[PDB]
# Entry
Amino acid sequence: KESYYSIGEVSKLANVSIKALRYYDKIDLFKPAYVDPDTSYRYYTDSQLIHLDLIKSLKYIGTPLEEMKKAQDLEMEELFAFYTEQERQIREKLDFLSALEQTISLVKKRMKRQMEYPALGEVFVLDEEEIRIIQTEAEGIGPENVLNASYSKLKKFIESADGFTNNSYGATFSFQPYTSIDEMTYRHIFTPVLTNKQISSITPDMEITTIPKGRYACIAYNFSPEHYFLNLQKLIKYIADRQLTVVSDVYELIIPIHYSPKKQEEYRVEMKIEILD
Amino acid sequence: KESYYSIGEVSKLANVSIKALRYYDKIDLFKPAYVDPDTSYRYYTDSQLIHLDLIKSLKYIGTPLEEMKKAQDLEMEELFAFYTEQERQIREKLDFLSALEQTISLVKKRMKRQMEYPALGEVFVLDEEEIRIIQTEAEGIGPENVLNASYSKLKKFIESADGFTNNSYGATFSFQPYTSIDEMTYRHIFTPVLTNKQISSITPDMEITTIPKGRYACIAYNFSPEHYFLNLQKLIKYIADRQLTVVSDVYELIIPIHYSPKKQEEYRVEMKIEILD
DNA sequence: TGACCCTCCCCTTAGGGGAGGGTC
DNA sequence: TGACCCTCCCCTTAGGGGAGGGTC
Ligand SMILES: CCNc1cc2oc3c/c(=[NH+]/CC)c(C)cc-3c(-c3ccccc3C(=O)OCC)c2cc1C
Ligand SMILES: CCNc1cc2oc3c/c(=[NH+]/CC)c(C)cc-3c(-c3ccccc3C(=O)OCC)c2cc1C
# Structure
């Protein structure tokens, strides 16, 4: 071959855009063998096309362009090693996605349950599967003064293990025949965990524990101040009327119904307490 | 809570950079509840922090920011569906990586073999595993006039199934006791395939076939014009001397030793021909 | 006074999409 | 004359890193 291909010809032959070729030229990754000193037209030799092989392959596996420059200088012995590295980075991506895929599925599972709920505003008993959680003591906090900020450390922690930060906020309190909200004080506030990912060195002010599998007397509803205490009361009454035995704190879970800064915020609230008989 | 968090406070609480908050502000994704009309300082309410939950989660799974705007307007019923979509896109990514991971491994396998080679310039017989390939007739082409461009359609095709374009170039020719290069003409030129990926509607001028598993008389060496024909001759002689029976065309494979536009190009050449006795 | 916050401004990666003007 | 090619120039995404100057 003693001619020359024009940019368009290379483009059509190698299945690479003309823009790409001009760019690889500027980058000094793949430069035409000859540039007409007047028209500036780019001209390529046939033998030179071989170099687009490595470039197109590396582009396919995501290698950044500047990285390619040092990959072409390596050499069949080291290129083998180079690939070994790309592999390790690929399995890294894979592991990440698999984990991610598992998490999304769990979020969806829990998300679906809050949609299958028997009825709102009514107490009912059901067999629950366990729920892993991370908690910390409430230090004075109660329904009237809890803040999103109160969950900062817990969230920082779960975020580090799940990536997918928590959706629901939890709190617990002693099952008592309260007569007023102000009488209530939280024992712990918690956020459920979604991963069995070996917790990133948990500090001792946090406790990894669980809302155990068992029978629970529950009530769920869409939050409204003049409903919070009444639903609690329905739970208290329900348990007293059928003489049930409470064997846990009252578990309280709050989950936003939407995250739109545009519409009036609304929350789903759920109170459950484990029972025996 | 009847105060206000400053940008720095939100940053520390939600584990999101200050720059990020300013940006989410500009984008109109997450805007502070209040902006001091004089200092321009941004101020946020505690209740508002809840919105960073969805945002941080979507950012974790790769959802583009502008996409988030429409995700917050959706609503626990549709958000479920939204996640289902993200899942489908995640498995898409996974499948891609797995395939990619398999390919890289095969490239490495073949790449290693050409490094384990017994010796260069010497004929030797070995048991080969099959090699899938895609070929087309050579139409007159021979060792003296083959061009990289000659492989354009074949490459376009393999690229579509492997992503990782071919590394080696092949050709075949009738086993004859040639006395000169010019007497040689290729029957087919081919590129090996690396994927069992249902070939993207192959046209009939191409043939999916194989260099079959079997015993081959081979010779590999680093290309040099005044060596090409001599090595062929060593093969011819080797086969005649031990009276072997040839049962295939001569398979010729060329692979660049490096893809550096900076150093003198060099190639590994390999000729193999299947035999019986 | 230190921290804290704000508004530019430049910069990163891999080209795609023109617009205006030559060029086999 | 159509195709073909070239050189700007603007633009995309998600902020990070300052620089210069106010601000609890
Ligand atoms: C077990 C999960 N724990 C939580 C429990 C909560 O119980 C609350 C009871 C109330 N009771 C009246 C008797 C009122 C007024 C607000 C409450 C908030 C609240 C705080 C700040 C801004 C908005 C809200 C808010 O509107 O939250 C919806 C529950 C709240 C928040 C969390 C995290
Ligand atoms: C089975 C694979 N098929 C191929 C076989 C080939 O055999 C060749 C034999 C030769 N023999 C002299 C008797 C010479 C001179 C060049 C050859 C080239 C070649 C063509 C253009 C630019 C550089 C080279 C080049 O330098 O290629 C290295 C082989 C070549 C290319 C391919 C794809």
About this structure: The longest helix of chain A spans residues 78-116. Residues 91 and 97 of chain A are 10 Å apart (CA to CA).
